[PDB]
Copies of this chain bind each other. A is one copy, B any other.
Protein backbone atom coordinates (compact mmCIF):
# COMPACT_ATOMS: atom_id res chain seq x y z
CA UNK A 1 0.00 0.00 0.00
CA UNK A 2 3.14 2.16 0.04
CA UNK A 3 2.32 3.19 -3.55
CA UNK A 4 0.48 6.31 -2.35
CA UNK A 5 3.81 8.16 -2.32
CA UNK A 6 4.90 6.41 -5.54
CA UNK A 7 1.66 6.34 -7.55
CA UNK A 8 -1.62 8.23 -7.81
CA UNK A 9 -5.04 6.56 -7.68
CA UNK A 10 -8.20 6.51 -9.77
CA UNK A 11 -10.50 3.84 -8.26
CA UNK A 12 -11.38 6.34 -5.50
CA UNK A 13 -11.69 9.64 -7.38
CA UNK A 14 -14.95 8.67 -9.08
CA UNK A 15 -16.12 7.01 -5.85
CA UNK A 16 -15.66 10.21 -3.84
CA UNK A 17 -17.02 12.40 -6.63
CA UNK A 18 -13.91 14.08 -8.02
CA UNK A 19 -13.82 13.55 -11.79
CA UNK A 20 -14.53 15.26 -15.09
CA UNK A 21 -17.57 14.30 -17.20
CA UNK A 22 -16.25 12.76 -20.41
CA UNK A 23 -18.96 11.81 -22.90
CA UNK A 24 -18.59 9.64 -25.98
CA UNK A 25 -16.04 7.02 -26.99
CA UNK A 26 -18.40 4.24 -25.89
CA UNK A 27 -17.07 1.98 -28.64
CA UNK A 28 -13.54 2.81 -27.49
CA UNK A 29 -14.23 1.88 -23.86
CA UNK A 30 -15.89 -1.26 -25.20
CA UNK A 31 -12.73 -2.04 -27.17
CA UNK A 32 -10.63 -1.51 -24.04
CA UNK A 33 -12.76 -3.83 -21.91
CA UNK A 34 -12.83 -6.46 -24.66
CA UNK A 35 -9.07 -6.41 -25.23
CA UNK A 36 -8.37 -6.54 -21.50
CA UNK A 37 -10.76 -9.50 -21.28
CA UNK A 38 -8.62 -11.91 -23.30
CA UNK A 39 -6.30 -14.84 -22.74
CA UNK A 40 -3.49 -13.57 -24.99
CA UNK A 41 -2.51 -10.22 -26.49
CA UNK A 42 -4.40 -8.27 -23.83
CA UNK A 43 -3.59 -4.93 -22.06
CA UNK A 44 -4.09 -2.49 -24.97
CA UNK A 45 -2.18 0.73 -25.64
CA UNK A 46 -4.16 3.86 -26.58
CA UNK A 47 -2.24 5.13 -29.61
CA UNK A 48 -2.90 8.57 -31.08
CA UNK A 49 -1.69 12.18 -31.03
CA UNK A 50 -0.93 14.59 -28.16
CA UNK A 51 -4.14 16.42 -27.30
CA UNK A 52 -6.96 14.02 -28.17
CA UNK A 53 -7.81 12.79 -24.69
CA UNK A 54 -6.40 9.33 -24.06
CA UNK A 55 -6.37 10.25 -20.38
CA UNK A 56 -10.02 11.12 -20.98
CA UNK A 57 -10.66 7.62 -22.33
CA UNK A 58 -9.03 6.10 -19.25
CA UNK A 59 -10.94 8.24 -16.75
CA UNK A 60 -14.18 7.53 -18.59
CA UNK A 61 -13.35 3.83 -18.34
CA UNK A 62 -12.81 4.18 -14.60
CA UNK A 63 -16.10 6.07 -14.29
CA UNK A 64 -17.93 3.33 -16.19
CA UNK A 65 -16.39 0.64 -13.97
CA UNK A 66 -17.31 2.39 -10.74
CA UNK A 67 -20.87 3.07 -11.94
CA UNK A 68 -20.98 -0.60 -12.91
CA UNK A 69 -21.05 -1.99 -16.44
CA UNK A 70 -18.17 -4.50 -16.40
CA UNK A 71 -18.19 -8.32 -16.71
CA UNK A 72 -17.54 -10.74 -13.86
CA UNK A 73 -13.75 -10.68 -14.20
CA UNK A 74 -13.62 -6.90 -13.59
CA UNK A 75 -14.87 -6.47 -10.02
CA UNK A 76 -13.69 -2.83 -9.90
CA UNK A 77 -10.09 -3.93 -10.34
CA UNK A 78 -8.63 -1.00 -8.33
CA UNK A 79 -7.35 0.88 -11.40
CA UNK A 80 -4.26 2.96 -10.64
CA UNK A 81 -1.75 5.13 -12.50
CA UNK A 82 2.02 5.46 -12.08
CA UNK A 83 3.70 8.78 -11.30
CA UNK A 84 6.90 9.09 -13.31
CA UNK A 85 7.63 12.02 -10.96
CA UNK A 86 9.45 9.70 -8.53
CA UNK A 87 12.81 10.13 -10.29
CA UNK A 88 16.96 5.17 -8.81
CA UNK A 89 16.01 1.63 -9.84
CA UNK A 90 16.00 0.65 -6.15
CA UNK A 91 12.55 2.25 -5.83
CA UNK A 92 11.09 0.45 -8.84
CA UNK A 93 11.52 -2.74 -6.84
CA UNK A 94 9.50 -1.10 -4.07
CA UNK A 95 6.68 -0.06 -6.40
CA UNK A 96 6.64 -3.47 -8.10
CA UNK A 97 6.64 -5.45 -4.84
CA UNK A 98 3.01 -4.43 -4.25
CA UNK A 99 2.18 -5.47 -7.82
CA UNK A 100 3.89 -8.86 -7.55
CA UNK A 101 2.05 -9.89 -4.38
CA UNK A 102 -1.08 -8.53 -6.10
CA UNK A 103 -3.76 -11.00 -7.19
CA UNK A 104 -4.29 -9.44 -10.62
CA UNK A 105 -6.71 -6.92 -9.09
CA UNK A 106 -4.30 -3.94 -8.96
CA UNK A 107 -3.93 -3.44 -12.72
CA UNK A 108 -1.95 -0.28 -13.47
CA UNK A 109 -1.84 2.36 -16.22
CA UNK A 110 1.42 3.90 -17.45
CA UNK A 111 1.21 7.11 -19.45
CA UNK A 112 3.78 7.52 -22.24
CA UNK A 113 5.25 4.04 -21.79
CA UNK A 114 7.72 4.38 -24.68
CA UNK A 115 10.01 5.89 -22.05
CA UNK A 116 10.14 2.65 -20.05
CA UNK A 117 10.53 0.38 -23.09
CA UNK A 118 14.91 -5.48 -17.95
CA UNK A 119 12.82 -4.88 -14.83
CA UNK A 120 9.18 -5.13 -15.95
CA UNK A 121 9.35 -7.20 -19.14
CA UNK A 122 9.98 -10.60 -17.45
CA UNK A 123 7.08 -9.93 -15.08
CA UNK A 124 4.89 -9.02 -18.06
CA UNK A 125 5.87 -12.28 -19.77
CA UNK A 126 4.56 -14.11 -16.69
CA UNK A 127 1.39 -12.02 -16.46
CA UNK A 128 0.88 -10.58 -12.97
CA UNK A 129 0.26 -7.01 -14.19
CA UNK A 130 -1.82 -5.58 -17.01
CA UNK A 131 -0.35 -2.08 -17.51
CA UNK A 132 -2.76 -0.31 -19.80
CA UNK A 133 -0.66 2.08 -21.85
CA UNK A 134 -0.77 5.20 -24.02
CA UNK A 135 1.64 6.45 -26.70
CA UNK A 136 1.70 8.10 -30.15
CA UNK A 137 2.07 6.63 -33.63
CA UNK A 138 5.63 7.68 -34.50
CA UNK A 139 7.11 6.84 -31.10
CA UNK A 140 5.21 3.54 -30.86
CA UNK A 141 6.58 2.49 -34.25
CA UNK A 142 10.07 3.66 -33.28
CA UNK A 143 10.34 1.71 -30.04
CA UNK A 144 8.12 -1.38 -29.89
CA UNK A 145 7.33 -2.07 -33.54
CA UNK A 146 10.63 -3.83 -34.29
CA UNK A 147 11.07 -6.17 -31.31
CA UNK A 148 8.55 -8.90 -32.15
CA UNK A 149 9.19 -10.44 -28.72
CA UNK A 150 7.09 -7.62 -27.24
CA UNK A 151 4.50 -7.29 -30.01
CA UNK A 152 3.19 -10.52 -28.44
CA UNK A 153 1.67 -8.70 -25.45
CA UNK A 154 0.50 -5.39 -26.92
CA UNK A 155 -2.61 -4.98 -29.08
CA UNK A 156 -2.78 -1.36 -30.18
CA UNK A 157 -5.96 0.71 -30.03
CA UNK A 158 -6.16 3.54 -32.58
CA UNK A 159 -7.91 6.73 -31.47
CA UNK A 160 -8.96 9.76 -33.48
CA UNK A 161 -10.41 13.13 -32.60
CA UNK A 162 -14.13 13.77 -32.15
CA UNK A 163 -15.97 15.64 -34.87
CA UNK A 164 -16.45 19.41 -34.96
CA UNK A 165 -20.05 19.29 -33.75
CA UNK A 166 -18.89 16.70 -31.21
CA UNK A 167 -16.33 19.10 -29.74
CA UNK A 168 -19.03 21.78 -29.74
CA UNK A 169 -21.44 19.53 -27.84
CA UNK A 170 -18.79 18.44 -25.34
CA UNK A 171 -17.65 22.02 -24.70
CA UNK A 172 -20.36 22.43 -22.04
CA UNK A 173 -18.04 20.89 -19.45
CA UNK A 174 -15.58 23.76 -19.86
CA UNK A 175 -17.79 26.82 -19.29
CA UNK A 176 -15.86 27.81 -16.14
CA UNK A 177 -12.35 26.35 -16.57
CA UNK A 178 -10.40 29.25 -18.08
CA UNK A 179 -12.62 32.36 -18.26
CA UNK A 180 -12.66 33.27 -14.57
CA UNK A 181 -10.20 36.15 -14.82
CA UNK A 182 -11.95 39.10 -16.50
CA UNK A 183 -15.50 37.75 -16.19
CA UNK A 184 -16.34 38.15 -19.88
CA UNK A 185 -19.65 36.39 -20.50
CA UNK A 186 -19.32 33.26 -22.62
CA UNK A 187 -21.81 33.03 -25.49
CA UNK A 188 -22.78 29.95 -27.49
CA UNK A 189 -22.32 31.97 -30.69
CA UNK A 190 -18.61 32.56 -30.06
CA UNK A 191 -18.40 29.03 -28.64
CA UNK A 192 -19.55 27.42 -31.89
CA UNK A 193 -17.51 29.96 -33.88
CA UNK A 194 -14.23 29.20 -32.07
CA UNK A 195 -13.60 25.71 -33.44
CA UNK A 196 -15.17 26.77 -36.76
CA UNK A 197 -12.06 28.79 -37.68
CA UNK A 198 -9.69 25.88 -37.04
CA UNK A 199 -7.66 26.29 -40.26
CA UNK A 200 -7.23 30.08 -40.19
CA UNK A 201 -3.85 29.97 -38.40
CA UNK A 202 -2.43 26.42 -38.30
CA UNK A 203 -3.54 22.91 -39.28
CA UNK A 204 -0.88 21.14 -37.18
CA UNK A 205 -3.10 21.53 -34.11
CA UNK A 206 -6.14 19.33 -33.54
CA UNK A 207 -9.74 19.64 -32.37
CA UNK A 208 -10.24 18.39 -28.81
CA UNK A 209 -7.65 20.33 -26.78
CA UNK A 210 -6.04 22.54 -29.42
CA UNK A 211 -9.40 24.19 -30.06
CA UNK A 212 -9.32 24.95 -26.33
CA UNK A 213 -5.81 26.32 -26.87
CA UNK A 214 -7.28 28.58 -29.56
CA UNK A 215 -10.09 29.68 -27.24
CA UNK A 216 -7.68 30.51 -24.43
CA UNK A 217 -5.42 32.39 -26.84
CA UNK A 218 -8.49 34.40 -27.83
CA UNK A 219 -9.53 35.11 -24.24
CA UNK A 220 -5.98 36.23 -23.41
CA UNK A 221 -5.70 38.50 -26.44
CA UNK A 222 -9.07 40.11 -25.69
CA UNK A 223 -8.19 40.63 -22.02
CA UNK A 224 -4.92 42.19 -23.22
CA UNK A 225 -6.41 44.59 -25.80
CA UNK A 226 -9.70 45.65 -24.17
CA UNK A 227 -7.99 45.19 -20.78
CA UNK A 228 -16.63 44.67 -23.56
CA UNK A 229 -18.71 42.39 -21.32
CA UNK A 230 -19.27 39.66 -23.93
CA UNK A 231 -17.24 37.36 -26.16
CA UNK A 232 -17.40 37.99 -29.88
CA UNK A 233 -17.01 35.47 -32.71
CA UNK A 234 -15.32 37.80 -35.20
CA UNK A 235 -13.15 39.00 -32.30
CA UNK A 236 -11.85 35.48 -31.63
CA UNK A 237 -11.43 35.36 -35.41
CA UNK A 238 -9.27 38.49 -35.34
CA UNK A 239 -7.27 36.85 -32.54
CA UNK A 240 -6.53 33.69 -34.52
CA UNK A 241 -6.06 35.72 -37.73
CA UNK A 242 -3.75 38.54 -36.58
CA UNK A 243 -0.69 36.29 -36.96
CA UNK A 244 -1.38 34.39 -40.16
CA UNK A 245 -2.10 37.85 -41.52
CA UNK A 246 -0.81 41.34 -40.72
CA UNK A 247 -4.16 43.26 -40.91
CA UNK A 248 -5.76 40.26 -39.17
CA UNK A 249 -5.52 38.55 -42.58
CA UNK A 250 -8.41 37.89 -44.90
CA UNK A 251 -11.87 38.46 -43.42
CA UNK A 252 -14.89 36.21 -43.87
CA UNK A 253 -14.90 34.43 -47.22
CA UNK A 254 -15.91 37.30 -49.53
CA UNK A 255 -14.47 35.60 -52.61
CA UNK A 256 -14.91 38.87 -54.55
CA UNK A 257 -11.67 40.04 -52.90
CA UNK A 258 -8.85 38.33 -54.82
CA UNK A 259 -9.93 35.13 -56.56
CA UNK A 260 -12.79 36.47 -58.71
CA UNK A 261 -10.24 38.63 -60.53
CA UNK A 262 -7.36 36.12 -60.77
CA UNK A 263 -5.74 37.98 -63.69
CA UNK A 264 -4.54 41.32 -62.26
CA UNK A 265 -1.12 39.73 -61.87
CA UNK A 266 -1.54 36.83 -64.29
CA UNK A 267 -3.07 38.46 -67.36
CA UNK A 268 -0.68 41.43 -67.16
CA UNK A 269 2.44 39.45 -66.20
CA UNK A 270 2.15 36.43 -68.52
CA UNK A 271 1.27 37.72 -71.99
CA UNK A 272 -0.57 34.96 -73.85
CA UNK A 273 -1.81 31.58 -72.63
CA UNK A 274 -5.17 33.29 -72.09
CA UNK A 275 -7.12 30.04 -72.45
CA UNK A 276 -4.98 28.22 -69.88
CA UNK A 277 -5.20 31.14 -67.44
CA UNK A 278 -8.97 31.48 -67.80
CA UNK A 279 -9.33 27.72 -67.34
CA UNK A 280 -7.20 27.55 -64.19
CA UNK A 281 -9.03 30.63 -62.88
CA UNK A 282 -12.36 28.86 -63.37
CA UNK A 283 -10.84 25.78 -61.74
CA UNK A 284 -9.66 27.64 -58.65
CA UNK A 285 -13.03 29.35 -58.36
CA UNK A 286 -14.62 25.89 -58.45
CA UNK A 287 -12.05 24.48 -56.03
CA UNK A 288 -10.56 27.03 -53.61
CA UNK A 289 -13.50 27.10 -51.20
CA UNK A 290 -13.27 23.62 -49.71
CA UNK A 291 -15.86 22.83 -52.38
CA UNK A 292 -14.37 19.89 -54.28
CA UNK A 293 -14.16 16.79 -52.05
CA UNK A 294 -12.79 15.38 -48.76
CA UNK A 295 -9.17 16.08 -47.93
CA UNK A 296 -7.46 16.18 -51.32
CA UNK A 297 -4.70 18.57 -52.43
CA UNK A 298 -7.76 20.48 -53.70
CA UNK A 299 -5.97 21.13 -56.99
CA UNK A 300 -4.34 19.21 -59.84
CA UNK A 301 -3.97 19.98 -63.55
CA UNK A 302 -1.60 19.86 -66.52
CA UNK A 303 -1.00 21.85 -69.70
CA UNK A 304 1.39 22.09 -72.63
CA UNK A 305 4.06 24.40 -74.00
CA UNK A 306 7.40 24.58 -75.83
CA UNK A 307 10.45 26.68 -74.99
CA UNK A 308 9.88 30.43 -75.00
CA UNK A 309 6.22 30.73 -74.03
CA UNK A 310 6.35 31.67 -70.35
CA UNK A 311 5.60 28.53 -68.36
CA UNK A 312 8.21 29.26 -65.69
CA UNK A 313 6.96 32.85 -65.85
CA UNK A 314 3.39 31.82 -65.03
CA UNK A 315 4.75 29.61 -62.25
CA UNK A 316 6.70 32.46 -60.64
CA UNK A 317 3.88 34.93 -61.37
CA UNK A 318 1.11 33.10 -59.53
CA UNK A 319 3.48 32.94 -56.53
CA UNK A 320 3.22 36.60 -55.51
CA UNK A 321 -0.59 36.41 -55.75
CA UNK A 322 -1.97 33.04 -54.61
CA UNK A 323 -0.64 33.61 -51.09
CA UNK A 324 0.80 37.16 -51.29
CA UNK A 325 4.44 36.18 -50.81
CA UNK A 326 7.45 34.69 -52.59
CA UNK A 327 7.53 31.17 -51.10
CA UNK A 328 3.94 30.37 -52.07
CA UNK A 329 5.37 27.75 -54.44
CA UNK A 330 7.84 24.90 -54.60
CA UNK A 331 9.24 23.88 -58.00
CA UNK A 332 10.75 20.40 -58.12
CA UNK A 333 12.91 19.08 -60.96
CA UNK A 334 13.56 15.33 -61.09
CA UNK A 335 17.00 15.64 -62.73
CA UNK A 336 17.82 13.55 -59.65
CA UNK A 337 14.57 11.55 -59.27
CA UNK A 338 14.90 9.58 -62.48
CA UNK A 339 15.97 6.17 -61.18
CA UNK A 340 15.06 3.97 -58.22
CA UNK A 341 18.25 5.09 -56.46
CA UNK A 342 16.61 8.39 -55.47
CA UNK A 343 12.87 7.70 -55.05
CA UNK A 344 13.58 7.30 -51.32
CA UNK A 345 15.56 10.56 -51.06
CA UNK A 346 12.42 12.74 -50.95
CA UNK A 347 11.01 10.67 -48.07
CA UNK A 348 13.13 13.69 -47.13
CA UNK A 349 14.51 16.39 -49.42
CA UNK A 350 11.21 18.25 -49.84
CA UNK A 351 9.73 17.22 -46.49
CA UNK A 352 11.78 19.72 -44.47
CA UNK A 353 10.45 22.81 -46.25
CA UNK A 354 6.98 21.43 -46.95
CA UNK A 355 6.51 20.64 -43.25
CA UNK A 356 8.10 23.82 -41.90
CA UNK A 357 6.18 26.24 -44.15
CA UNK A 358 3.03 24.52 -45.48
CA UNK A 359 2.04 27.60 -47.50
CA UNK A 360 3.30 26.67 -50.95
CA UNK A 361 2.06 25.21 -54.23
CA UNK A 362 3.94 22.19 -55.55
CA UNK A 363 5.30 22.33 -59.09
CA UNK A 364 6.86 19.76 -61.39
CA UNK A 365 7.74 21.46 -64.67
CA UNK A 366 8.49 18.33 -66.70
CA UNK A 367 7.95 14.58 -66.40
CA UNK A 368 10.52 13.88 -69.12
CA UNK A 369 12.93 13.70 -66.16
CA UNK A 370 10.79 11.46 -63.93
CA UNK A 371 10.53 7.75 -62.90
CA UNK A 372 7.27 5.76 -62.51
CA UNK A 373 7.85 5.34 -58.76
CA UNK A 374 7.34 8.98 -57.87
CA UNK A 375 4.16 8.34 -59.88
CA UNK A 376 2.87 5.93 -57.24
CA UNK A 377 4.20 8.15 -54.45
CA UNK A 378 2.06 11.05 -55.66
CA UNK A 379 -0.82 8.68 -56.39
CA UNK A 380 -0.88 7.52 -52.76
CA UNK A 381 -0.62 11.21 -51.88
CA UNK A 382 -3.79 11.80 -53.91
CA UNK A 383 -6.93 10.65 -52.05
CA UNK A 384 -5.30 7.68 -50.25
CA UNK A 385 -3.57 9.56 -47.45
CA UNK A 386 -1.92 12.96 -47.24
CA UNK A 387 1.68 11.74 -46.80
CA UNK A 388 3.78 9.09 -45.07
CA UNK A 389 7.33 9.94 -44.03
CA UNK A 390 10.08 7.36 -43.67
CA UNK A 391 10.67 8.58 -40.13
CA UNK A 392 6.99 8.71 -39.20
CA UNK A 393 6.07 12.39 -38.98
CA UNK A 394 3.35 12.92 -41.59
CA UNK A 395 2.56 16.30 -43.15
CA UNK A 396 -0.78 17.12 -44.78
CA UNK A 397 -1.19 18.70 -48.22
CA UNK A 398 -3.97 21.21 -47.62
CA UNK A 399 -2.93 24.28 -49.62
CA UNK A 400 -1.03 22.53 -52.41
CA UNK A 401 -2.00 22.44 -56.09
CA UNK A 402 -0.53 19.95 -58.55
CA UNK A 403 0.79 21.37 -61.82
CA UNK A 404 2.67 20.09 -64.84
CA UNK A 405 3.40 22.42 -67.76
CA UNK A 406 5.02 19.78 -69.94
CA UNK A 407 6.29 19.69 -73.49
CA UNK A 408 4.59 16.30 -73.96
CA UNK A 409 3.39 16.35 -77.55
CA UNK A 410 4.11 19.99 -78.33
CA UNK A 411 4.83 19.29 -81.99
CA UNK A 412 1.29 18.00 -82.36
CA UNK A 413 -1.66 20.20 -81.57
CA UNK A 414 -4.64 18.40 -80.02
CA UNK A 415 -4.52 14.67 -80.82
CA UNK A 416 -0.87 13.67 -80.42
CA UNK A 417 -0.72 15.48 -77.08
CA UNK A 418 -3.81 13.70 -75.77
CA UNK A 419 -2.61 10.28 -76.94
CA UNK A 420 0.82 10.83 -75.38
CA UNK A 421 -0.82 11.92 -72.11
CA UNK A 422 -3.09 8.87 -72.06
CA UNK A 423 -0.01 6.72 -72.69
CA UNK A 424 2.89 8.12 -70.67
CA UNK A 425 0.90 8.67 -67.45
CA UNK A 426 -0.07 5.08 -66.72
CA UNK A 427 -1.29 5.27 -63.10
CA UNK A 428 -4.47 7.34 -62.77
CA UNK A 429 -3.02 10.77 -63.57
CA UNK A 430 -6.10 11.40 -65.73
CA UNK A 431 -9.22 10.58 -63.71
CA UNK A 432 -8.34 12.40 -60.48
CA UNK A 433 -6.68 15.40 -62.12
CA UNK A 434 -8.54 18.35 -63.64
CA UNK A 435 -8.65 19.59 -67.22
CA UNK A 436 -5.52 19.55 -69.38
CA UNK A 437 -4.92 22.83 -71.17
CA UNK A 438 -2.95 24.48 -73.98
CA UNK A 439 -0.82 27.52 -74.72
CA UNK A 440 -1.11 30.39 -77.21
CA UNK A 441 2.33 31.05 -78.71
CA UNK A 442 3.91 34.46 -79.16
CA UNK A 443 1.61 36.42 -81.47
CA UNK A 444 2.09 39.88 -83.02
CA UNK A 445 -0.77 41.08 -80.82
CA UNK A 446 0.91 39.65 -77.69
CA UNK A 447 4.18 41.56 -78.10
CA UNK A 448 3.24 45.07 -76.96
CA UNK A 449 2.78 44.12 -73.30
CA UNK A 450 5.98 42.08 -73.48
CA UNK A 451 8.03 45.07 -74.60
CA UNK A 452 6.18 47.30 -72.13
CA UNK A 453 7.05 45.20 -69.07
CA UNK A 454 10.60 44.67 -70.33
CA UNK A 455 11.13 48.42 -70.66
CA UNK A 456 9.55 48.99 -67.25
CA UNK A 457 12.00 46.56 -65.65
CA UNK A 458 14.96 48.10 -67.47
CA UNK A 459 13.80 51.49 -66.20
CA UNK A 460 13.52 50.44 -62.57
CA UNK A 461 16.99 48.91 -62.96
CA UNK A 462 18.34 52.19 -64.36
CA UNK A 463 16.68 54.25 -61.61
CA UNK A 464 19.71 53.73 -59.34
CA UNK A 465 21.59 56.24 -61.52
CA UNK A 466 18.52 58.50 -61.99
CA UNK A 467 18.08 57.99 -65.74
CA UNK A 468 14.79 57.49 -67.55
CA UNK A 469 13.99 56.32 -71.07
CA UNK A 470 11.65 58.05 -73.52
CA UNK A 471 10.46 55.14 -75.68
CA UNK A 472 8.33 56.03 -78.69
CA UNK A 473 6.03 53.69 -80.58
CA UNK A 474 8.31 53.76 -83.68
CA UNK A 475 11.06 51.90 -81.81
CA UNK A 476 8.51 50.04 -79.67
CA UNK A 477 7.45 48.36 -82.90
CA UNK A 478 10.83 48.33 -84.70
CA UNK A 479 12.19 46.08 -81.95
CA UNK A 480 9.00 44.00 -82.11
CA UNK A 481 9.60 43.53 -85.85
CA UNK A 482 12.91 41.66 -85.55
CA UNK A 483 12.05 40.14 -82.20
CA UNK A 484 9.21 37.81 -83.22
CA UNK A 485 10.97 34.51 -84.14
CA UNK A 486 8.27 32.15 -82.74
CA UNK A 487 10.62 29.17 -82.51
CA UNK A 488 12.81 30.42 -79.65
CA UNK A 489 10.62 32.93 -77.80
CA UNK A 490 11.13 36.09 -75.80
CA UNK A 491 14.84 35.49 -75.18
CA UNK A 492 15.68 36.88 -78.64
CA UNK A 493 13.73 39.98 -77.57
CA UNK A 494 15.64 40.23 -74.29
CA UNK A 495 19.01 39.77 -76.00
CA UNK A 496 18.10 42.33 -78.66
CA UNK A 497 17.01 44.80 -75.98
CA UNK A 498 20.33 44.23 -74.23
CA UNK A 499 22.42 44.63 -77.39
CA UNK A 500 20.65 47.53 -79.11
CA UNK A 501 19.79 49.62 -76.06
CA UNK A 502 22.25 48.60 -73.38
CA UNK A 503 25.46 48.16 -75.37
CA UNK A 504 25.30 51.68 -76.78
CA UNK A 505 23.92 53.12 -73.54
CA UNK A 506 26.77 51.58 -71.54
CA UNK A 507 29.35 52.76 -74.06
CA UNK A 508 28.11 56.34 -73.89
CA UNK A 509 27.65 56.26 -70.09
CA UNK A 510 31.41 55.97 -69.67
CA UNK A 511 31.93 58.08 -72.81
CA UNK A 512 30.50 61.00 -70.80
CA UNK A 513 27.71 63.16 -72.18
CA UNK A 514 25.01 60.96 -70.60
CA UNK A 515 25.78 62.03 -67.03
CA UNK A 516 23.39 60.93 -64.30
CA UNK A 517 20.05 62.74 -64.29
CA UNK A 518 19.63 62.95 -68.07
CA UNK A 519 16.85 61.40 -70.13
CA UNK A 520 17.38 59.59 -73.41
CA UNK A 521 14.95 59.05 -76.31
CA UNK A 522 14.69 56.27 -78.88
CA UNK A 523 15.01 57.01 -82.60
CA UNK A 524 14.70 54.36 -85.29
CA UNK A 525 17.39 54.25 -87.98
CA UNK A 526 17.31 52.18 -91.23
CA UNK A 527 19.15 49.24 -89.63
CA UNK A 528 20.06 50.47 -86.14
CA UNK A 529 18.36 52.83 -83.70
CA UNK A 530 20.15 55.56 -81.79
CA UNK A 531 19.64 57.11 -78.36
Show the binding face of A for B, using Cβ within 8 Å.
Answer: 6, 8, 30, 33-35, 37-41, 50-51, 69-71, 83-86, 93, 111-112, 115, 118-119, 121-122, 125, 147-150, 152, 177-178, 181-182, 209, 212-213, 216-217, 220-221, 223-224, 226-227, 253, 255, 282, 285-286, 289-294, 327, 331, 333, 335-336, 345, 348-349, 352-353, 388, 390, 392, 419, 422-423, 426, 428, 435, 461-465, 494-495, 498-499, 502-503, 505-507, 509-511
Complex CA distance for A197 and B289, rounded to whole angstroms: 46
A392, B349: Cβ atoms closer than 8 Å:
yes
Instruction: Give every chain B residue within 8 A of A426 (Cβ-Cβ).
Output: 331
Instruction: Give every chain B residue within 8 A of A494 (Cβ-Cβ).
Output: 293
Complex CA distance for A345 and B388, rounded to whole angstroms: 11
Instruction: Give every chain B residue within 8 A of A349 (Cβ-Cβ).
Output: 392
Q: Say how far A229's CB is from chain B's closest CB, in angstroms.
A: 15
A38, B217: Cβ atoms closer than 8 Å:
yes
A216, B40: Cβ atoms closer than 8 Å:
yes
Q: Knowing that A39-B216, A85-B122, A349-B392 are A-B contacts, what are 6 other residue pairs whose CB atoms are under 8 Å apart, sorted by A's residue number?
A: A33-B224, A71-B224, A71-B227, A85-B147, A291-B462, A333-B423
Complex CA distance for A511 and B286, rounded to whole angstroms: 10
16 A-B pairs whose Cβ atoms sit less than 8 Å apart in the complex: A6-B118, A34-B220, A34-B221, A34-B224, A38-B217, A40-B216, A85-B147, A86-B121, A255-B511, A286-B510, A290-B464, A290-B465, A291-B464, A292-B498, A345-B392, A435-B499
A149, B84: Cβ atoms closer than 8 Å:
yes
Complex CA distance for A353 and B394, rounded to whole angstroms: 12
A291, B506: Cβ atoms closer than 8 Å:
yes
Q: Say how far A260's CB is from chain B's closest CB, in angstroms.
A: 8
B509, A51: Cβ atoms closer than 8 Å:
no
Instruction: Give every chain B residue within 8 A of A498 (Cβ-Cβ).
Output: 292-293
A292 and B461 in contact (CB under 8 A), knowing A69-B227, A121-B83, A150-B85?
A: yes
A149 and B83 in contact (CB under 8 A), knowing A112-B118, A285-B510, A293-B461?
A: yes
A332 closest partner in B (C-beta): B388
B39, A503: Cβ atoms closer than 8 Å:
no
Instruction: Give every chain B residue within 8 A of A423 (Cβ-Cβ).
Output: 333, 335-336
Instruction: Give every chain B residue within 8 A of A216 (Cβ-Cβ).
Output: 38-41
Instruction: Give every chain B residue within 8 A of A35 (Cβ-Cβ).
Output: 220
